Write a protein that binds this ligand. Structure first.
Ligand SMILES: CNC(=O)CN1C[C@@H](C(=O)Nc2cncc3cc(F)ccc23)c2cc(Cl)ccc2C1=O
Ligand SMILES: [Cl-]
Lengths: 297, 305
């Protein structure tokens, strides 16, 4: 028993973290095979600035060893530094683009040195509520499936509200953001409804049933209520995805939606669910099934 | 900016996780140098668990009865000894992935990262605290025994906890890496219960200082308090007594934010009386006690917003 915000073991990613310095800027890079991937703003019209640069301008440090840059190219907002040495610690990996509501682990780094690991979710407004300081740029987001690391996020910047913005490993930003100091703001955020429901199922599995009721709701009536509390619309796909948890607990998804409706209109009344006084939306249905089963990496 | 519950990178610990099997029991072991450390209850049956005589069970064992697996490689056990509630299996290979390490015993209120494992395979990492009642509110299932708690300050791993059991309330009990339990617990399936738990006051105060550093001051008031009057109010909400040691420890955060410890204590007193009134502090509707003063100084900026 117990329900914690759990991150993937970071070891396979730690073996890829490097420090990249270009002039006065120092940030983190991801060394996979003979390529170091890092935010293109380390050079700060990016192609016009990049064309002036030579290979020896980029200093890459892997632990106490200096890597030799033998080539460089730009892909969207990511810089790809070709190095002379293949990373012997390169794990089996894929570059994947995640959707909002999906969760991932973040290995926060400073000077190519991992300092912490935390779990978080891609918000519906495409920002992440991370924990980053100056020097964190180039820190990466990932998930693990058996022995394969799926890289999904590279940190680029902080917004005025304290939230974070970044790209997939192919350099495409998540959200309507650009990589420069300009007037940018996160859009109004919403709650990830399918994740709150999964977390209510996790509470039932851990013996927390005070919020259950005899009632049910139609999907349309639930969405009419949820739209009023800035909750993301619940689709039939979300309902199908919650199927296994529904069969395990004996509580139909629309039956759990009727509990969520009552929680939204009436609150917790001095009570908590899994030690929380707020409705938690940073655990996906798969995260709940994985943590309430025992899957290893 | 931002304030997350952050765990240490688990890589140096993952390279030490092994699977230990003795008869029908399978749990996790920690392989450091040529020794594998694991809960001594791996030698037990579920029957034995009521009143196990470990010395009697261990003397009946030979080296080849203990199967140790590191990945897909079988380690050979060449010796065994018991130290308190930990079994130490001497093996014929030193772990090449052994990091710089120490065995440290922590005090309640201290935090640490947990690498949860099943069958010598790490599955997840989370941050938690040693509760005042010596239990940990972990996330463990059957097969997690032998999972370890650690801190990685600088490049040295300080092992502080080894998981041994789950109490009836769902909380967890374990030992330091020398086999001494935290709390009045025994590795017996006897009727044991966690004592009434309390809130780690010095940690809640540190987290209020972290909120001030991140630009939030809604909860501050114009009042101060004596340490004794704060403790008289705090005990009424099941908060741990705040000692002069805690006040001294909060010194650097007080100097950084310009808010005296007993002034922050007055804000805490007020928060306990009023509640949050629909407001949050660092994204939380409850008062957080699983961040130490040291964690706050480590994670938060040196420049207050
Ligand atoms: C809740 N456990 C039980 O009813 C059976 N039980 C087995 C074992 C034990 O607690 N293991 C487990 C550890 N952590 C999480 C566990 C989650 C589980 F769902 C099951 C087992 C877990 C044990 C070890 C010792 Cl040293 C003393 C007593 C016991 C004991 O009582
Ligand atoms: Cl300590």
């Amino acid at each position: 028993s117990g329900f914690r915000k759990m991150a993937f073991p970071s070891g396979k990613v730690e073996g890829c973290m490097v420090q990249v310095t270009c002039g006065t800027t120092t940030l983190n890079g991801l060394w996979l095979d003979d390529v170091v991937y890092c935010p293109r703003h380390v050079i700060c019209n990016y192609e016009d600035l990049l064309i002036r640069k030579s290979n020896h301008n980029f200093l890459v440090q892997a632990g106490n060893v200096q890597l030799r840059v033998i080539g460089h190219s730009m892909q969207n907002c990511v810089l790809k530094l070709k190095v002379d040495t293949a990373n012997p610690k390169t794990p089996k990996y894929k570059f994947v683009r995640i959707q909002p509501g999906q969760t991932f682990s973040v290995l926060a780094c400073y000077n190519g040195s991992p300092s912490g690991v935390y779990q978080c979710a891609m918000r519906p407004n495409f920002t992440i509520k991370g924990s980053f300081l100056n020097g964190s740029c180039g820190s990466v987001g990932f998930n693990i499936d058996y022995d394969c690391v799926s890289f999904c996020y590279m940190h680029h910047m902080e917004l005025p509200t304290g939230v974070h913005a970044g790209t997939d490993l192919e350099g495409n930003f998540y959200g309507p953001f650009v990589d420069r100091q300009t007037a940018q703001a996160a859009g109004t955020d919403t709650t990830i409804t399918v994740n709150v429901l999964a977390w209510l199922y996790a509470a039932v599995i851990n013996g927390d049933r005070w919020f259950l009721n005899r009632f049910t709701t139609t999907l349309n009536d639930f969405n009419l209520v949820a739209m009023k509390y800035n909750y993301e619309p619940l689709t039939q796909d979300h309902v199908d995805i919650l199927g296994p948890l529904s069969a395990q607990t004996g509580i139909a998804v629309l039956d759990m939606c009727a509990s969520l409706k009552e929680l939204l209109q009436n609150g917790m009344n001095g009570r908590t669910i899994l030690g929380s006084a707020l409705l938690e939306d940073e655990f996906t249905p798969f995260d709940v099934v994985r943590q309430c089963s025992g899957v290893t990496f």
